[PDB]
């Protein structure tokens, strides 16, 4: 009954930014997770609520795949019960998560001499994000008691900042691609 494109959600030509993470629905296939096992230069591979070795002997109604790109030292924030900039204002995982998180380095593909300014993350926001929520707004952020009136200046800042990836950076500041698999009550081989 066909095999869902686990390859295309793992070797896409370009990934999305963390504040605009890309969601793909996977259903009605014979999920052969051998692709995950065969390629293991994985910086992080952690499954919550299910064992990694049992993925082929269990089924769900549908599977969700979320793809984005972050920096290395923020990879630890993609986990339930974790707090931080990315966890609060960019991407939040519920405390009762039942999926897997995969993250691997992409220095060759995403870094560039002089900086890559196509990857953006949200810096200023007023409240924590609800689990599985995305905010793609670009409205000016008010930091004082005077209305911004849609201009940039003191106490009025643009909410997004670019990572600016370049090869001469440290290990922790290099780009890492992250794919999150969410399962809820697709079958294995």
């Amino acid at each position: 009954t066909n095999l869902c494109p686990f390859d295309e959600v793992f070797n896409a030509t370009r990934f999305a930014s963390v504040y605009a993470w890309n969601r793909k629905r996977i259903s009605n296939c014979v999920a052969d997770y051998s692709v995950l096992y065969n390629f293991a230069p994985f910086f992080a591979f952690k499954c919550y609520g299910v064992s990694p070795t049992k993925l082929n002997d269990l089924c769900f109604t549908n599977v969700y795949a979320d793809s984005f790109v972050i920096r290395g030292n923020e990879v630890s924030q993609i986990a339930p019960g974790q707090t931080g900039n990315i966890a609060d204002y960019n991407y939040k995982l519920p405390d009762d998560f039942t999926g897997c998180v995969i993250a691997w380095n992409s220095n060759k593909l995403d870094s560039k001499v002089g900086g890559n300014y196509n990857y953006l993350y949200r810096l200023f926001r007023k409240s924590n994000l609800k689990p599985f929520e995305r905010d793609i707004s670009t409205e000016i952020y008010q930091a004082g008691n005077k209305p911004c009136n849609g201009v940039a200046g003191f106490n009025c800042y643009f909410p997004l900042r670019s990572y600016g990836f370049r090869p001469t950076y440290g290990v922790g500041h290099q780009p890492y691609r992250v794919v999150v698999l969410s399962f809820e009550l697709v079958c294995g081989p």
């Epitope: 030292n73 923020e74 707090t83 931080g84 900039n85 609060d88 204002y89 810096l123 926001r125 007023k126 409240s127 924590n128 952020y141 008010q142 930091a143 004082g144 008691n145 106490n155 800042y157 900042r161 600016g164 950076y169 440290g170 290990v171 922790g172 500041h173």
Partner: antibody, heavy 117, light 108 residues
Framework: EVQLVESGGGLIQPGGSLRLSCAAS????????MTWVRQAPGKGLEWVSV???????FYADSVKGRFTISRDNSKNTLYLQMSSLRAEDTAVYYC???????????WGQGTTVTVSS | DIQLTQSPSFLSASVGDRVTITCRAS??????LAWYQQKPGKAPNLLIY???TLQSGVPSRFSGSGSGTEFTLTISSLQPEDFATYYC?????????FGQGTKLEIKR
């Protein structure tokens, strides 16, 4: 005008408690990163605590489990509560607004805290 | 945990000289470093952010540059109101680490 004014310093025995207040004008404490730092006499600067505009609080390792950071929107004030004080914590404290990669731009006047016998 | 080091802890110069101060990290910081100035008995002031940009109001004689593990701050034409201590700061994922401090004095 935009400014920060600090208060709550004095003499406290080694083991008491204190509550330092930082009142802001022109800056909303509920919408910015707020930071408490300190400087010992002739010993350079050091970071103590930070609070986000979402309730998340982060503390330094040397001061974990002893200090608390709170925010009051009605009075527009940032409070630092100190408990289980030690003789190494005597210093001048500052409250500042942090913008992350844009740095800490606005600083307070600084209040002295001296602990001894 | 990453630490920053100021190499010229103490340094003396006359009015009109050119001065360069270096701050070196341990592993890697990217282009997020802040240069602050502190006079004795007063609160610190922000001079440089992002290792290259000048804060509004800072005189143009201050200039910073660097990326990776070493950064530098240069003052081209000293004035009598430029003798104080200087610090380098960086965030690095919910931490805040400052430098030891570089003191600038007058020569005689």
């Amino acid at each position: 005008e935009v400014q920060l004014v600090e208060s709550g310093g004095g003499l406290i025995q080694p083991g008491g408690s204190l509550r330092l207040s930082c009142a802001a004008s022109g800056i909303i404490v509920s919408s910015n990163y707020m930071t408490w730092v300190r400087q010992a006499p002739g010993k350079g600067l050091e970071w103590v605590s930070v609070i986000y505009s979402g309730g998340s609080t982060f503390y330094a390792d040397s001061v974990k489990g002893r200090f608390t950071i709170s925010r009051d929107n009605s009075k527009n004030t940032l409070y630092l509560q100190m408990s289980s004080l030690r003789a190494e914590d005597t210093a001048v404290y500052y409250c500042a607004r942090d913008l992350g990669p844009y740095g800490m731009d606005v600083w307070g006047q600084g209040t002295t805290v001296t602990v001894s016998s | 945990d990453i630490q920053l080091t100021q190499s010229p802890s103490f340094l003396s110069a006359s009015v009109g000289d050119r001065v360069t101060i270096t701050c070196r990290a341990s592993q890697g910081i990217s282009s997020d470093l802040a240069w602050y100035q502190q006079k004795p008995g007063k609160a610190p002031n922000l001079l440089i952010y992002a290792a290259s940009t000048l804060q509004s109001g800072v005189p143009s004689r201050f200039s910073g540059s660097g990326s990776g593990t070493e950064f530098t701050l240069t003052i081209s034409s000293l004035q009598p109101e430029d003798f104080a201590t200087y610090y380098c700061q960086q965030l690095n994922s919910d931490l805040y680490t400052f430098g030891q401090g570089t003191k600038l004095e007058i020569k005689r």
